[PDB]
């Protein structure tokens, strides 16, 4: 599978919540974002996180998303 | 000794081969108890006093 | 041999309590305007072309 | 243009060289050859009977031509094939230390290999010459 755990999804929510100006449709920049704006202990988890706080953006751009 | 060893009839493969095979050969694991394993046969017994003093 | 060509148009599912059998709707290409549902043996996807060896008859559930 | 042995395929080069030494007669050929088994890991003698020492000689030559230094131990191994332990799994086995060490001495007496320093045996100054020669003759058969 590839269902993203709660830790991933919980951070993502928490980032989109308090930094929507800043952040984008681009994971490439959202990666670099997370580093400055968030303490995370692994490269891997950071990517797993940014990639999904990205995906979440990507469709807010077309309608809202609960949560 | 070795003298008796060979002279002795009653021996060698021929003689065994000719005899029938015991039935105990092709049997079982014999077991004897395995589903009485949880029923302690000590006859004894702790006691809620002792176990309370201990634990 | 009145062989018959039919184009798999939809994957519907696996019947047979084993499962090796796919329920499939097919469209003929030798005169379309009629579709019909057949049971396969092998691995199938959309646009495959079964050799319907009896143009008419069809199965449902297997056991 | 100029020609090597490395410019010619394994089989043909050796077979011509094997034929060459045979065509010649200067050699040295133990004498037990015909009754010997090439390796303990084998079943029957070579099928060439008269010959095959050449085939080895030629091979042995061609091999030490292609490199710095190799000796008895390395040559034993190379030629060693697998050996059916009857009802037991195969292992690889080393080959006769005698065929080779005598192929080594023999080909040297014929000047194709000198007992190199660093150990082993090395392609003689002369060998390069004569090897490259029948090598050349080998590609001439496709002229």
């Amino acid at each position: 599978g590839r269902v993203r755990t709660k830790t991933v999804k919980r951070a993502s929510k928490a980032l989109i919540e308090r930094y929507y100006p800043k952040l984008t449709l681009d994971f490439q920049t959202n990666k670099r974002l997370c580093d400055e704006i968030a303490t995370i202990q692994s490269k891997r988890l950071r990517n797993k996180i940014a990639g999904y706080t990205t995906h979440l953006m990507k469709r807010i751009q077309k309608g809202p998303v609960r949560g | 000794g070795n003298e008796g060893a060979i002279r002795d009839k009653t021996a060698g493969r021929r003689n065994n081969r000719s005899k029938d095979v015991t039935d105990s050969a092709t049997t079982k694991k014999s077991n004897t108890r395995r589903a009485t394993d949880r029923h302690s046969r000590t006859g004894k017994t702790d006691t809620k006093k002792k176990v309370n003093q201990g634990w | 041999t009145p062989v018959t060509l039919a184009k798999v148009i939809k994957v519907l599912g696996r019947t047979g309590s084993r499962g090796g059998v796919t329920q499939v709707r097919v469209e003929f290409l030798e005169d379309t305007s009629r579709t019909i549902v057949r049971n396969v043996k092998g691995p199938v996807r959309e646009n495959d072309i079964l050799v319907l060896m009896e143009s008419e008859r069809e199965a449902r559930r297997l056991r | 243009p100029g020609v090597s042995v490395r410019d010619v395929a394994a089989q043909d080069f050796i077979n011509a060289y094997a034929s060459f030494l045979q065509r010649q007669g200067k050699l040295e050929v133990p004498g037990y050859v015909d009754i010997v088994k090439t390796s303990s890991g084998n079943e029957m003698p070579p099928q060439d009977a008269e010959g095959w020492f050449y085939k080895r000689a030629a091979s042995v030559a061609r091999h030490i031509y292609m490199r710095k230094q190799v000796g008895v131990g390395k040559l034993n191994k190379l030629y060693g094939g697998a050996k059916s332990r009857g009802v037991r799994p195969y292992k690889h086995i080393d080959a006769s230390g005698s065929i080779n060490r005598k192929v080594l001495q023999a080909l040297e007496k014929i000047g194709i290999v000198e007992i190199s320093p660093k150990g082993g045996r090395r392609i003689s100054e002369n060998g390069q010459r004569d090897l490259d020669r029948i090598a050349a003759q080998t590609l001439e058969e496709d002229e």
Binding site: - | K29 | - | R6, D7, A9, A10, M66
Partner: protein
């Protein structure tokens, strides 16, 4: 020196190193012409890039390849890759680019991975069988 580059190929554990310099027009492997290389039935595998992208192309360059590790197939795949990777790097630094991109194109369109090395590799065995996936025979009682 002359204009040149070095490129490699890798299959399994074969790594095939290839030096490509401007030259008269050869292609030797470990120490021999490519018209041998036997393995053999495969030989058209390592011919492949030459003919893939036109015999000419090599008239201006020389090429050496030496392969270590690997095994009697592993190496044939490794070296074709390094040949064809080398032709497509030389042009990257020396000819023009639309050349290089033309060569990448004709190679990938054919391809048994000539430019990209196959990621596959032996998986560890684990205790309980004679193989990575295989398990030893069992019996119950």
């Amino acid at each position: 020196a002359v204009p040149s580059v070095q490129t490699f190929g890798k299959k399994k554990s074969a790594t095939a190193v290839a030096h490509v310099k401007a030259g008269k027009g050869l292609i030797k492997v470990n120490g021999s012409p490519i018209t041998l290389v036997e393995p053999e039935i495969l030989r058209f595998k390592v011919y492949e890039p030459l003919l893939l992208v036109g015999l000419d192309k090599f008239s201006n360059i020389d090429i050496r390849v030496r392969v270590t590790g690997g095994g009697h197939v592993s190496q044939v795949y490794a070296i074709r890759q390094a040949i064809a990777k080398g032709l497509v790097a030389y042009h990257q630094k020396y000819v023009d680019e639309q050349s290089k991109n033309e060569l990448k194109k004709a190679f990938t369109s054919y391809d048994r991975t000539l430019l990209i090395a196959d990621s596959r590799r032996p998986e560890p065995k684990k205790f309980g069988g004679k193989g990575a996936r295989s398990r030893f025979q069992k019996s119950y009682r």
